[PDB]
Design an enzyme around this catalytic site. Structure first.
Site, PDB file in Angstrom:
ATOM      1  N   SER A 433       0.951  -1.141  -0.098  1.00 13.56           N
ATOM      2  CA  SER A 433       0.011   0.066  -0.038  1.00 13.56           C
ATOM      3  C   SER A 433       0.728   1.246   0.004  1.00 13.56           C
ATOM      4  O   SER A 433       0.350   2.301  -0.287  1.00 13.56           O
ATOM      5  CB  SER A 433      -1.101  -0.129   1.195  1.00 13.56           C
ATOM      6  OG  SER A 433      -1.840  -0.976   1.143  1.00 13.56           O
ATOM      7  N   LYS A 476      -7.733   3.492   6.763  1.00 11.12           N
ATOM      8  CA  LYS A 476      -6.911   4.476   6.330  1.00 11.12           C
ATOM      9  C   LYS A 476      -7.820   5.876   6.264  1.00 11.12           C
ATOM     10  O   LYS A 476      -7.104   6.913   6.850  1.00 11.12           O
ATOM     11  CB  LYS A 476      -6.453   4.312   5.136  1.00 11.12           C
ATOM     12  CG  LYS A 476      -5.406   2.891   4.911  1.00 11.12           C
ATOM     13  CD  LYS A 476      -5.175   2.635   3.421  1.00 11.12           C
ATOM     14  CE  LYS A 476      -3.982   1.442   3.534  1.00 11.12           C
ATOM     15  NZ  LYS A 476      -4.017   0.906   2.407  1.00 11.12           N
TER      16      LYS A 476
END
Ligand SMILES: Nc1ncnc2c1ncn2[C@@H]1O[C@H](COP(=O)(O)OP(=O)(O)O)[C@@H](O)[C@H]1O
Ligand SMILES: [Mg+2]
Lengths: 525, 62
Positions: A433, A476
């Site tokens: 990521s 996130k």
């Protein structure tokens, strides 16, 4: 005494396959001696055969408005379970008759899987019964013993039906994932006999020796992880994932349910002990960042009991909690700092990470390892995993390629020796990521320009610079919003994940969706 | 009463010679008892199984 057993059967529409057994058992009772042991066991058998309900169904409430009003009365935010229940009523109105399902609720502890069963039963106007199979080692609890034994009793299901007096109650089977695989008769085989539509219609108990129709009962099974339910069992029941609660939802349950109940079990009115919204939000942010609500309940109870001790001891007549003195009640904050950098220097870029205790912020720092204006090299530290190390290599190659064409005269990346670190040494981190974050850090270090000071980004990067979707978008986003981020960069393939989130999460974020890294370069610089 | 249920059904001898013995045992045991119930079930589901009934197979592939 035969007339009593006869009269108990007037209101029951008894099926023939057991009515003929009842008739011969009454005949035997009429032929046996008054004080024989066989007489006693026969009379007990008739008591069980006549006490079991035949054809009795509770008046299931079908009003989708009243049922819903019951659902939001007890629990907050469990939208999926409530919608599943209201589409059980709908489908049971359009079919016409009381129907049964076998539903499994699984998720983290303390999210309401066990407690919502009683509210569902109340909404359906169904009788509620709960028994736990955690640590269960023997089958005799479910299927009983032959009545020939001295102390024979029916199983849990037959006792359930006798107590509820209805053939369509709600049976909550708790901790189905932790059923013990005993030696002398595995109870999971009996659970398979209960949770199987093709044979639960004639489930047979050892004591009754007659089949009972369990196709109308609504089985609700509660588990923690779906990986350890027996395979023939988990394929025959619908799985509903009860996810945890975000900070705003936790505040909602705290203000609405937890604090009033804690006050009720503590005796402190709002005047004696003040618990404002800001204090509760601070508790959520700094102490109760888990997924369940038990930790929040414990923290609230701790605050209230400390206030009670202060009041009883005569230290003060009233206790008022402030964010300036909450640590005097709940001790050291667990999460005191949200971001390491307030104003990023040129070499660092802010990123996002998934974590069980809510979302996590990560930073990527790059530094010049050797003095320079043969080829360069990249050192990587920070307990990075193999996949994340490969992501860093790909990001380094793409950063070289991108700087080769955007700034042809800039040879910083191809000649200088660079060390890349993610500043949390003790915590292992893995996943692709952070590829775009690594590219941004390398380019910002090479150009000597810091990125936007309230920007966060996440996304996998290919060797040609394409941005790929990444997981954990909710965590996130929560971490970015918590850390005061105003602009967030996401892969374009995560648009459906981002817009699936609740409105209060994404309200203040200037989100950007990108297909290739050049868009991220335009955004960050 | 059990014999009529197999009147229109071919019964092999090696079980027919047990059916009558068990029927006699039922006729000599006392009514409505444990052994009586067991013998009743045994006679019932000897005479219920289709010794002489064969389903017609489909000989055509079409
Ligand atoms: N969404 C919710 N709204 C209100 N209270 C909740 C909610 N979820 C959990 N609770 C509270 O948490 C307590 C324990 O939850 P529990 O049913 O044991 O969760 P789990 O089944 O995950 O262990 C219950 O007393 C219940 O009041
Ligand atoms: Mg539970």
């Amino acid at each position: 005494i035969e007339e009593k057993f006869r009269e108990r059967l007037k209101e029951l529409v008894v099926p023939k396959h057991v009515m003929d057994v009842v008739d011969e058992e009454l005949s035997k009772l009429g032929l046996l001696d008054n004080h024989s042991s066989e007489f006693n066991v026969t009379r007990n058998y008739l008591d069980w055969l006549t006490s079991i309900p035949w054809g009795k169904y509770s008046n299931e409430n079908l009003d989708l408005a009243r049922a819903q009003a019951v659902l939001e009365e007890d629990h907050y935010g469990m939208e999926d379970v409530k919608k599943r229940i209201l589409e059980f009523i709908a489908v049971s109105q359009l079919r016409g008759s009381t129907q049964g399902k076998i539903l499994c609720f699984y998720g983290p502890p303390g999210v309401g899987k066990t407690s919502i069963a009683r509210s569902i039963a109340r909404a359906l106007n169904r009788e509620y019964f709960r028994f736990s199979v955690g640590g269960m080692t023997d089958v005799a609890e479910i299927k009983g013993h032959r009545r020939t034994y001295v102390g024979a009793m029916p199983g849990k299901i037959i006792q359930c039906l006798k107590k509820t007096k209805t053939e369509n109650p709600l049976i909550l089977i708790d901790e189905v994932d932790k059923i013990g695989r005993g030696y002398q008769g595995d109870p999971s085989s009996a659970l398979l006999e209960l949770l199987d539509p093709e044979q639960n219609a004639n489930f047979l108990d050892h004591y009754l020796d007659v089949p009972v129709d369990l196709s109308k009962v609504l089985f609700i099974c509660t588990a923690n992880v779906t990986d350890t339910i027996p395979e023939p069992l988990r394929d025959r029941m619908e799985m509903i994932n009860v996810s945890g609660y975000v900070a705003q939802e936790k505040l909602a349950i705290a203000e609405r349910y937890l604090v009033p109940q804690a006050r009720a079990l503590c005796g402190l009115d709002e005047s004696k002990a003040k618990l404002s919204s800001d204090v509760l939000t601070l508790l959520i942010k700094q102490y109760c960042r888990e997924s369940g609500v038990r930790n929040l309940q414990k923290q609230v109870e701790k605050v209230l009991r400390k206030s009670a001790y202060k009041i009883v001891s005569g230290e003060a007549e009233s206790v008022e909690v402030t964010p300036e003195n909450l640590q005097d009640f709940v001790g050291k904050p667990v999460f005191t700092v949200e971001r390491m950098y307030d104003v990023t220097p040129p070499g660092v870029v802010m990123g996002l990470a998934w974590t069980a205790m809510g979302g996590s912020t990560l930073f990527v720092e790059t530094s010049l390892r050797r003095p320079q204006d043969k080829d360069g090299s990249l050192e990587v530290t920070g307990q990075l995993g193999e996949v994340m190390k490969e992501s860093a290599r790909i990001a380094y190659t793409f950063a070289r390629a991108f700087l080769m064409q955007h700034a042809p005269a800039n040879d910083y990346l191809v000649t200088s020796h660079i060390h890349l670190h993610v500043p949390e040494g003790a915590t292992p981190k893995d996943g692709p990521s952070a590829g775009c974050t690594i590219v941004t850090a390398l380019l910002s270090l090479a150009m000597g320009r810091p990125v936007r000071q309230n920007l966060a980004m996440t996304g996998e990067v290919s060797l040609t610079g394409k941005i790929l979707p990444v997981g954990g978008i909710k965590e996130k986003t929560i971490a970015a919003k918590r850390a005061g981020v105003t602009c967030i960069v996401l892969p374009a393939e995560n648009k459906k994940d981002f817009y699936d989130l609740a409105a209060f999460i994404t309200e203040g974020l200037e989100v950007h969706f990108v297909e290739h890294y050049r868009e991220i370069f335009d955004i960050a610089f």
